[PDB]
Design a protein around this nucleic acid. Structure first.
Ligand SMILES: *C(=O)[C@H](CCSC)NC=O
Ligand SMILES: [K+]
Ligand SMILES: [K+]
Ligand SMILES: [K+]
Ligand SMILES: [K+]
Ligand SMILES: [K+]
Ligand SMILES: [K+]
Ligand SMILES: [K+]
Ligand SMILES: [K+]
Ligand SMILES: [K+]
Ligand SMILES: [K+]
Ligand SMILES: [K+]
Ligand SMILES: [K+]
Ligand SMILES: [K+]
Ligand SMILES: [K+]
Ligand SMILES: [K+]
Ligand SMILES: [K+]
Ligand SMILES: [K+]
Ligand SMILES: [K+]
Ligand SMILES: [Mg+2]
Ligand SMILES: [Mg+2]
Ligand SMILES: [Mg+2]
Ligand SMILES: [Mg+2]
Ligand SMILES: [Mg+2]
Ligand SMILES: [Mg+2]
Ligand SMILES: [Mg+2]
Ligand SMILES: [Mg+2]
Ligand SMILES: [Mg+2]
Ligand SMILES: [Mg+2]
Ligand SMILES: [Mg+2]
Ligand SMILES: [Mg+2]
Ligand SMILES: [Mg+2]
Ligand SMILES: [Mg+2]
Ligand SMILES: [Mg+2]
Ligand SMILES: [Mg+2]
Ligand SMILES: [Mg+2]
Ligand SMILES: [Mg+2]
Ligand SMILES: [Mg+2]
Ligand SMILES: [Mg+2]
Ligand SMILES: [Mg+2]
Ligand SMILES: [Mg+2]
Ligand SMILES: [Mg+2]
Ligand SMILES: [Mg+2]
Ligand SMILES: [Mg+2]
Ligand SMILES: [Mg+2]
Ligand SMILES: [Mg+2]
Ligand SMILES: [Mg+2]
Ligand SMILES: [Mg+2]
Ligand SMILES: [Mg+2]
Ligand SMILES: [Mg+2]
Ligand SMILES: [Mg+2]
Ligand SMILES: [Mg+2]
Ligand SMILES: [Mg+2]
Ligand SMILES: [Mg+2]
Ligand SMILES: [Mg+2]
Ligand SMILES: [Mg+2]
Ligand SMILES: [Mg+2]
Ligand SMILES: [Mg+2]
Ligand SMILES: [Mg+2]
Ligand SMILES: [Mg+2]
Ligand SMILES: [Mg+2]
Ligand SMILES: [Mg+2]
Ligand SMILES: [Mg+2]
Ligand SMILES: [Mg+2]
Ligand SMILES: [Mg+2]
Ligand SMILES: [Mg+2]
Ligand SMILES: [Mg+2]
Ligand SMILES: [Mg+2]
Ligand SMILES: [Mg+2]
Ligand SMILES: [Mg+2]
Ligand SMILES: [Mg+2]
Ligand SMILES: [Mg+2]
Ligand SMILES: [Mg+2]
Ligand SMILES: [Mg+2]
Ligand SMILES: [Mg+2]
Ligand SMILES: [Mg+2]
Ligand SMILES: [Mg+2]
Ligand SMILES: [Mg+2]
Ligand SMILES: [Mg+2]
Ligand SMILES: [Mg+2]
Ligand SMILES: [Mg+2]
Ligand SMILES: [Mg+2]
Ligand SMILES: [Mg+2]
Ligand SMILES: [Mg+2]
Ligand SMILES: [Mg+2]
Ligand SMILES: [Mg+2]
Ligand SMILES: [Mg+2]
Ligand SMILES: [Mg+2]
Ligand SMILES: [Mg+2]
Ligand SMILES: [Mg+2]
Ligand SMILES: [Mg+2]
Ligand SMILES: [Mg+2]
Ligand SMILES: [Mg+2]
Ligand SMILES: [Mg+2]
Ligand SMILES: [Mg+2]
Ligand SMILES: [Mg+2]
Ligand SMILES: [Mg+2]
Ligand SMILES: [Mg+2]
Ligand SMILES: [Mg+2]
Ligand SMILES: [Mg+2]
Ligand SMILES: [Mg+2]
Ligand SMILES: [Mg+2]
Ligand SMILES: [Mg+2]
Ligand SMILES: [Mg+2]
Ligand SMILES: [Mg+2]
Ligand SMILES: [Mg+2]
Ligand SMILES: [Mg+2]
Ligand SMILES: [Mg+2]
Ligand SMILES: [Mg+2]
Ligand SMILES: [Mg+2]
Ligand SMILES: [Mg+2]
Ligand SMILES: [Mg+2]
Ligand SMILES: [Mg+2]
Ligand SMILES: [Mg+2]
Ligand SMILES: [Mg+2]
Ligand SMILES: [Mg+2]
Ligand SMILES: [Mg+2]
Ligand SMILES: [Mg+2]
Ligand SMILES: [Mg+2]
Ligand SMILES: [Mg+2]
Ligand SMILES: [Mg+2]
Ligand SMILES: [Mg+2]
Ligand SMILES: [Mg+2]
Ligand SMILES: [Mg+2]
Ligand SMILES: [Mg+2]
Ligand SMILES: [Mg+2]
Ligand SMILES: [Mg+2]
Ligand SMILES: [Mg+2]
Ligand SMILES: [Mg+2]
Ligand SMILES: [Mg+2]
Ligand SMILES: [Mg+2]
Ligand SMILES: [Mg+2]
Ligand SMILES: [Mg+2]
Ligand SMILES: [Mg+2]
Ligand SMILES: [Mg+2]
Ligand SMILES: [Mg+2]
Ligand SMILES: [Mg+2]
Ligand SMILES: [Mg+2]
Ligand SMILES: [Mg+2]
Ligand SMILES: [Mg+2]
Ligand SMILES: [Mg+2]
Ligand SMILES: [Mg+2]
Ligand SMILES: [Mg+2]
Ligand SMILES: [Mg+2]
Ligand SMILES: [Mg+2]
Ligand SMILES: [Mg+2]
Ligand SMILES: [Mg+2]
Ligand SMILES: [Mg+2]
Ligand SMILES: [Mg+2]
Ligand SMILES: [Mg+2]
Ligand SMILES: [Mg+2]
Ligand SMILES: [Mg+2]
Ligand SMILES: [Mg+2]
Ligand SMILES: [Mg+2]
Ligand SMILES: [Mg+2]
Ligand SMILES: [Mg+2]
Lengths: 112, 246, 29, 50
RNA sequence: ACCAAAGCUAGCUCAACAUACUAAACAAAUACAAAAAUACACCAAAAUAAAAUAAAACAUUCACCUAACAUUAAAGUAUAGGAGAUAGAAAUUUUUAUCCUGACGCUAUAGAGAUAGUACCGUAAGGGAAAGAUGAAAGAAUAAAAUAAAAGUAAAAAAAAGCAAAGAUUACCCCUUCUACCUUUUGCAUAAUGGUUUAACCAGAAAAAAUCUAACAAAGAGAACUUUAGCUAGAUACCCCGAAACCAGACGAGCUACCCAUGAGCAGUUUAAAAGAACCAACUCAUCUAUGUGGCAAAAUAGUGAGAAGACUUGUAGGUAGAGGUGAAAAGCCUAACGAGCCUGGUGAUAGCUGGUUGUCCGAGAAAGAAUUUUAGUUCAACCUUAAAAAUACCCCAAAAACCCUAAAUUCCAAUGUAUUUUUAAGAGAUAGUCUAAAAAGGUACAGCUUUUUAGAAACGGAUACAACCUUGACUAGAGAGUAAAAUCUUAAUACU
RNA sequence: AACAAACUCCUAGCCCAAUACCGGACUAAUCUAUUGAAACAUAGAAGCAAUAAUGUUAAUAUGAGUAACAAGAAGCCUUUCUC
RNA sequence: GUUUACCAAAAACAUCACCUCUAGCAUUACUAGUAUUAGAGGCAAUGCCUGCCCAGUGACACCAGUUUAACGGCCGCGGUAUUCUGACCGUGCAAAGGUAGCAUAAUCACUUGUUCUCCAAAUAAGGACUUGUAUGAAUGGCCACACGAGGGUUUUACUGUCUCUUACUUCCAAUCAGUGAAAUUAACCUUCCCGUGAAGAGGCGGGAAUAAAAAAAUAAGACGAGAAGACCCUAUGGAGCUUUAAUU
RNA sequence: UCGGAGUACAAAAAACCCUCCGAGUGAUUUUAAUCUAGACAAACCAGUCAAAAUAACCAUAACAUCACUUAUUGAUCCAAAAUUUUGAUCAACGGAACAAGUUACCCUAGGGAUAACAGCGCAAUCCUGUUCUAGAGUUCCUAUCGACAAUAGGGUUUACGACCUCGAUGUUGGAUCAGGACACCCAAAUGGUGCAACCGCUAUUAAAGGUUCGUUUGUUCAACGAUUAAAGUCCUACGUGAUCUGAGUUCAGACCGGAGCAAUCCAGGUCGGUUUCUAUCUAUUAUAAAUUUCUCCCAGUACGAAAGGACAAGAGAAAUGGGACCAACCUCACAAACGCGUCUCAGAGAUAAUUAAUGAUUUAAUCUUAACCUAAUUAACUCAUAAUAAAUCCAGCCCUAGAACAGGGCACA
């Protein structure tokens, strides 16, 4: 016969994890890019409009399992929390960046 | 060579052709980076570090006034009139260690370069040279062998009139009455005492200048230099004298 | 090449045949 | 080309020829070649087949 | 021992100088059908060159390509271009005379085509060769000297068995071991391509950026330019043969198509008939079959056939010429090939396509990701080669990477084992893949089938033969030794009174 | 057990395969600059090397002494016969 | 009568006849002519005929319009007389809806349509039946005399065509004497079988056979010799022809 | 061309004329600024995020939202608008500024990288045998058959793949000559039967020989007439064109129907249409020792209610095939050749399926991959037997011997 399926060809977007645990990253480096929320951002990690995670401070990347407390203004998420039984808590994965360099140091500039 | 194709038969396409695909040099929008580059003026930079270096080694001497011709004979700078070079600009790279006292004439100067020279008690003046005149000025001996009268130096174009008319740039066409007040402003700005140049024994040499219609020192338009006989020819007709002096 | 599952008792690689012959069952005597 | 390849085979062919002579001379005494060689090495007698 | 071999002149090439440039011969005859002494004439002419090609197609465009007055620079600059390919000035500058001219040019398949535009092939324009060797004397031919060396033959036919040889051997064979050589391919002893053999001849060429060596150095260069260690000079580089075609100008209607002139043929027989009537010769066509197929013949011979007073055959001579002529249209014929002649010039047309590519040895050594009138090709990335700089590369434990269920396992990383990797500067090839094991898909849970991902291989040993399976770190010599993969696989069965 | 490799030992070394592309060291034969003087050395230059293009020219073979070609007879020699 | 000189001589072209079209006229064609003339074409004597259609295109008029012997075209669906058939009727679209004739034809397929005659036996041939849903009227329909190196069938007569080959002559042929060519050729010391293999082996593997040469024969193989496959595809390779391709 | 899910199971990437969904934009207002660290992605061109800083406004205010939110899009040049800005089903979507058909009149360069013919691979299709019994067979599974299903093998058909050949592997049917297989049509032997006999159906064993002549079609095939013991199936480059044929396919001419405005096209028909080769090598160029049918007879017997009607055994005559020969007839103008004419044609061993005797494992029985002995029994095949036979005159002539070379005669002829 004849082919009915069309348009199935599309290259991958290379969605995945870029920096593993222990990698030393600087400010602005994209930790990971994703389609859906696979890894939630953590401490010192921003979140772009396309759900990509980028480090805000220079340091060591760490991955952690933590609890999930949704924003009350998010109607869909708060409804899911409402229907949970009393003994359960949501758990999600997070990406952290523990800072390495200190904020600054005091130096002698002038001795009057 | 290879095995078959356009490699072994030597008929591969031109340079920059990517096989039907639009080439890299044809998919970039046109913008003016070299628009009118053949008409932009160029100035060879001269640093005060090199100017001090020439004087210490005897390449040039401050006793005699220094202009573009003396720099070329000293192998300090090379000027190519063909490549739209309009002279030498003074830069301030070595202003801190400049201890010479000269009467230098250039085609462009900076605020710090002028201040550095005036600190020691020198004179800086900027003059414009047409490419027809600049070729003669940089290579005087070849010109004198062409058997032609010395022509008048042309005026700067409308674009370069303000630069050589203001007293801030020490323009050759500037009003001399505004030089002393402009000189003192630089002395006040950089905090150096302005020397009284009129009390130095070289005041006659330091005050030497050129007429705007004059090319060389002491020579006049219309003169023919017969180098073989070591004699200078001068015109006599009223029209010839008027044309070469107007 | 044939599929992993066929209808004709797929012939093993010769190295695998030796493995199937050295790992036989010998009843106690 | 045949000269070099045969030169490699020259050593093999002569070694094969020696074994046939050793086997022929060993069978004459009623002892096979495999029994004549291993039971001679066990006596620490290191004689090559040549 | 024949056939053969050897020789060094003939002359030529590229310049320079240079008179200033259709030679030599012209007694007679030469543009009547040239070389024929002699009668009322006509005579003469111009209209931009086009295209093959490049732009990977092709329409605007495409250097030189008829007419420039040169050289050093301005400059491959200003400008002109489906603004693509490529095309490209000027203003302004530089240049001292005569002699010193000859040859790191050839030596009879070279150099001009040349002993010669002659033989010879073409109606014509046109194409166009091979060919010489003794010595001081051949007025020294019972004459003399020289290599006796190419393929091919003779002296001298052959004796089982094999890519014609090697290992050898007292011995030519007999024995043992080896699937011609290049090209082209995933893979060729292949029954895929080319070559009978010999001699002669025949195919890599350019200096912008770069690397190596040297001069001088913040300056270099014997002007004109380049310069934040650069500038000047040297050395290191990129083939040959071949289309069908396209354009312009010549020469061809003595064959053939048609026509205009001028001539010449048709006997007998049958009919009031010279009626595109009838029988049958000369004569003209060529239906059918058989010989012939490098033939007698680049279209014929033998037999047999159709017309044979007409729209008929035929001689001489003239006319129409290729964007055309001519045609009772067969897309026929126009000098033995006409879907549009031949010759020369443009022309060394251009081919991603086929074939060819000439001494020895040594080092390292690649199977395909992305665009593309693109998949028969190119240009990038990866990989790799040469040189250089630098510090980290592989293996890599614990920790770590998603939400309903989910295998083999990947990513990332210290130690450790080991020397690799990155960067900079120059680069080409390749981009047409075959099988085995594993995870899948299409198919017939078919293919030596097809599309992807991971891994392997392309022995001179083993599976008798064998590209892909197994053993194997590919040097040379030895008549030494130890080993690896591996050589014949199992059963072949049932009395129940 | 044995027999069995480009593997690995043993004795000497010049001390490890290859297609496209790339790198290197040498070198046959010519001419020229200086040497050399029974045929060479160090250099500078190129028409610088042919077992392969249904390659060009010339000469040789094989096919093969094979395919195929021709003169009517006798005599007294040029005259009679047969077509 | 004519044509593809050199594979087609025919059913193709021409042709008398009929018809359409364009032109009122002078010094080189047509023509030393003047519409009963001369060109540009179609179709093919004769005989009986040549039906309907200017919507489209083209031409003329160059405006309405006029022209098909100009290019071309010349219909569905549903119901209806016991059954069958469908005179008729409903409804729709068109410029008109294939009229006369002939017909399983040289006429898509169905197809060896069905039937009769011919033969012992008929995918042949002739005569009928006939929607041929793709026949058809000067791109001509239909009928006939004469004619045909066209194509098909039947009877009669003859015969080596054949059942079934044979005898005898000449040119070839084979021996002797003379002259003496061509395609071809990697090297050959050039076997058979089974198996293997770039998938059909004189050459590999496992076995068999095996003194060496000459002459005369038959053509199974050497993927025999000959022509760089005419078929097929590819090439940003050509050319001829046509037009509603692009540019002009 | 662009996006999502599976193939691609756990970092990334990953294909098919693979399996399924979509996009070539709408709705709304929160109308979404300037400038810059660092990164993801990637051949390139493109695509994405983004802290700090500045301005905007709660006076220390930057993610436009929703529809699977992911895709909702286009490079230069060029053109138009104010200079801010815009412009393509350029969808062939990395895009030539603007270009269709046909070629069987075809040409050139190449490809077995790629088709038709042939081989090969494979077995969907096809063919052959077995396993399983529901049932058909009046009762009765398997005398003859056997649905739904199981399993093994053959390589004939149409396909599938595109692996060897396109610097050529010549292509249907006949003519000639046939080589081979057995899954046998006839001939021979035998088991079973819903086998009385006759005529049949079915199964086992055997391949030495044989398998007709005609009308139509180019035909293989098929139909029909006559006959035979029977008119087998298939392989062999669907054998065989360097042996022949060219009717058909399969060039150039020409009509008819149809498609196209045309050129031209049609596995639609019709008429016509060049079939080349001198044999180099391999291979090859005569032994025999028959086969079938019909008649008569047995016999109108056996067998059967009758109707019908045998086998074996005996005798004879023909046909084909093998090998020979002219007294006659016939071809016959040589003294020969020739057919249409004449002549001749064979014994023993040995077997397959099957049938029977004796007899043990199993003191019965039982033909025995139990022993000994023995019996009935297909065709091949083997052999008896027959043919061949003398080593060494050979110039010449003759010959029923012969291409040459050889061979037989030449004393009385
Ligand atoms: C099929 O017809 C083809 C020829 C085409 S040209 C007559 N066969 C080729 O072998
Ligand atoms: K071939
Ligand atoms: K080839
Ligand atoms: K070749
Ligand atoms: K003429
Ligand atoms: K002739
Ligand atoms: K290509
Ligand atoms: K005729
Ligand atoms: K009309
Ligand atoms: K009829
Ligand atoms: K005729
Ligand atoms: K043969
Ligand atoms: K495209
Ligand atoms: K198949
Ligand atoms: K072929
Ligand atoms: K048979
Ligand atoms: K042979
Ligand atoms: K006869
Ligand atoms: K028993
Ligand atoms: Mg993809
Ligand atoms: Mg996808
Ligand atoms: Mg090549
Ligand atoms: Mg290639
Ligand atoms: Mg394109
Ligand atoms: Mg400069
Ligand atoms: Mg596989
Ligand atoms: Mg072009
Ligand atoms: Mg090209
Ligand atoms: Mg031009
Ligand atoms: Mg313009
Ligand atoms: Mg010469
Ligand atoms: Mg020579
Ligand atoms: Mg010789
Ligand atoms: Mg041998
Ligand atoms: Mg091989
Ligand atoms: Mg191939
Ligand atoms: Mg290759
Ligand atoms: Mg070959
Ligand atoms: Mg080839
Ligand atoms: Mg050849
Ligand atoms: Mg350079
Ligand atoms: Mg052109
Ligand atoms: Mg022309
Ligand atoms: Mg004539
Ligand atoms: Mg007459
Ligand atoms: Mg007549
Ligand atoms: Mg004749
Ligand atoms: Mg004849
Ligand atoms: Mg005759
Ligand atoms: Mg006649
Ligand atoms: Mg007649
Ligand atoms: Mg002429
Ligand atoms: Mg014409
Ligand atoms: Mg004619
Ligand atoms: Mg025609
Ligand atoms: Mg035609
Ligand atoms: Mg010609
Ligand atoms: Mg070329
Ligand atoms: Mg590829
Ligand atoms: Mg690269
Ligand atoms: Mg770990
Ligand atoms: Mg590490
Ligand atoms: Mg490729
Ligand atoms: Mg593959
Ligand atoms: Mg495969
Ligand atoms: Mg791989
Ligand atoms: Mg081996
Ligand atoms: Mg080793
Ligand atoms: Mg060993
Ligand atoms: Mg190596
Ligand atoms: Mg390769
Ligand atoms: Mg040298
Ligand atoms: Mg050379
Ligand atoms: Mg040579
Ligand atoms: Mg040839
Ligand atoms: Mg050659
Ligand atoms: Mg010669
Ligand atoms: Mg000869
Ligand atoms: Mg011969
Ligand atoms: Mg002869
Ligand atoms: Mg006629
Ligand atoms: Mg003809
Ligand atoms: Mg004729
Ligand atoms: Mg003819
Ligand atoms: Mg009429
Ligand atoms: Mg008529
Ligand atoms: Mg006609
Ligand atoms: Mg007609
Ligand atoms: Mg009509
Ligand atoms: Mg009208
Ligand atoms: Mg009728
Ligand atoms: Mg009719
Ligand atoms: Mg029909
Ligand atoms: Mg017929
Ligand atoms: Mg007939
Ligand atoms: Mg009829
Ligand atoms: Mg019709
Ligand atoms: Mg009409
Ligand atoms: Mg018609
Ligand atoms: Mg008549
Ligand atoms: Mg007739
Ligand atoms: Mg008759
Ligand atoms: Mg002879
Ligand atoms: Mg032999
Ligand atoms: Mg074989
Ligand atoms: Mg062998
Ligand atoms: Mg063999
Ligand atoms: Mg002969
Ligand atoms: Mg012969
Ligand atoms: Mg061969
Ligand atoms: Mg053949
Ligand atoms: Mg051949
Ligand atoms: Mg070809
Ligand atoms: Mg074709
Ligand atoms: Mg293409
Ligand atoms: Mg083209
Ligand atoms: Mg062209
Ligand atoms: Mg043309
Ligand atoms: Mg148009
Ligand atoms: Mg990256
Ligand atoms: Mg901010
Ligand atoms: Mg462009
Ligand atoms: Mg594209
Ligand atoms: Mg893309
Ligand atoms: Mg372009
Ligand atoms: Mg035709
Ligand atoms: Mg061709
Ligand atoms: Mg391929
Ligand atoms: Mg064939
Ligand atoms: Mg096939
Ligand atoms: Mg084949
Ligand atoms: Mg099978
Ligand atoms: Mg029942
Ligand atoms: Mg099966
Ligand atoms: Mg293939
Ligand atoms: Mg394939
Ligand atoms: Mg060949
Ligand atoms: Mg036959
Ligand atoms: Mg047979
Ligand atoms: Mg049987
Ligand atoms: Mg029977
Ligand atoms: Mg055949
Ligand atoms: Mg045939
Ligand atoms: Mg023939
Ligand atoms: Mg043949
Ligand atoms: Mg025919
Ligand atoms: Mg027609
Ligand atoms: Mg005929
Ligand atoms: Mg025909
Ligand atoms: Mg022979
Ligand atoms: Mg023959
Ligand atoms: Mg009887
Ligand atoms: Mg007989
Ligand atoms: Mg008993
Ligand atoms: Mg015997
Ligand atoms: Mg005798």
């Amino acid at each position: 016969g004849s082919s009915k399926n069309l348009g199935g060809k599309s290259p991958g977007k290379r969605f995945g994890i870029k920096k593993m645990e222990g990698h030393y990253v600087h400010a602005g480096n994209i930790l990971a890019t994703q389609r859906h929320f696979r890894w939630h951002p953590g401490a010192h990690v921003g979140l772009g409009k396309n759900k990509c995670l980028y480090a805000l401070e220079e340091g060591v990347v760490r991955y952690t399992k933590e609890v999930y407390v949704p924003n009350p203004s998010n109607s869909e998420a708060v409804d899911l929390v409402t229907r949970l039984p009393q003994g359960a808590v949501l758990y999600k994965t997070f990406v952290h960046v523990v800072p390495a360099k200190p904020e600054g140091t005091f130096k002698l500039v002038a001795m009057l | 060579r290879g095995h078959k194709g356009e490699r072994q038969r030597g008929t591969r396409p031109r340079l920059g052709f990517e096989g039907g695909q639009t080439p890299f040099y044809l998919r970039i929008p046109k913008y003016g980076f070299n628009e009118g580059h053949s008409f932009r003026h160029q100035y060879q930079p001269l640093s005060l570090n090199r100017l001090q270096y020439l004087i210490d080694l005897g390449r040039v001497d401050p006793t005699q006034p220094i202009d573009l011709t003396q720099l070329v004979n000293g192998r300090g700078v090379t000027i190519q009139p063909s490549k739209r070079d309009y002279g030498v600009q003074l830069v301030e790279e070595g202003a801190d260690t400049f201890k010479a006292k000269v009467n230098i004439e250039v085609q462009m100067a900076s605020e710090l370069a002028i201040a550095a020279i005036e600190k020691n008690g020198g004179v800086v003046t900027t003059a414009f040279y047409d490419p027809r005149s600049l070729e003669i000025l940089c290579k005087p001996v070849p010109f004198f062998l062409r058997g032609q009268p010395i022509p008048k130096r042309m005026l700067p174009p409308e674009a370069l009139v303000p630069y050589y008319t203001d007293a801030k740039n020490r323009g050759y066409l500037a009003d001399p009455a505004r030089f002393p007040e402009a000189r003192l402003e630089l002395a006040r700005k950089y905090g150096y005492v302005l020397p009284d140049i009129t009390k130095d024994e070289l005041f006659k040499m330091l005050s030497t200048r050129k007429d705007p219609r004059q090319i060389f020192f002491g020579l006049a338009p219309g003169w023919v230099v017969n180098m073989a006989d070591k004699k200078i020819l001068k015109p006599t007709d009223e029209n010839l004298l008027k044309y070469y002096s107007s | 090449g044939s599929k992993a599952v066929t209808r004709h008792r797929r012939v093993m690689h010769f190295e695998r045949q030796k493995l199937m012959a050295v790992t036989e069952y010998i009843p106690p005597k | 080309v045949k000269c070099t390849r045969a030169r490699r085979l020259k050593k093999r062919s002569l070694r094969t020829l020696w074994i046939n002579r050793i086997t022929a001379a060993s069978q004459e005494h009623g002892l096979k070649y495999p029994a004549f060689i291993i039971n001679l090495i066990k006596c620490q007698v290191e004689l090559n087949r040549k």
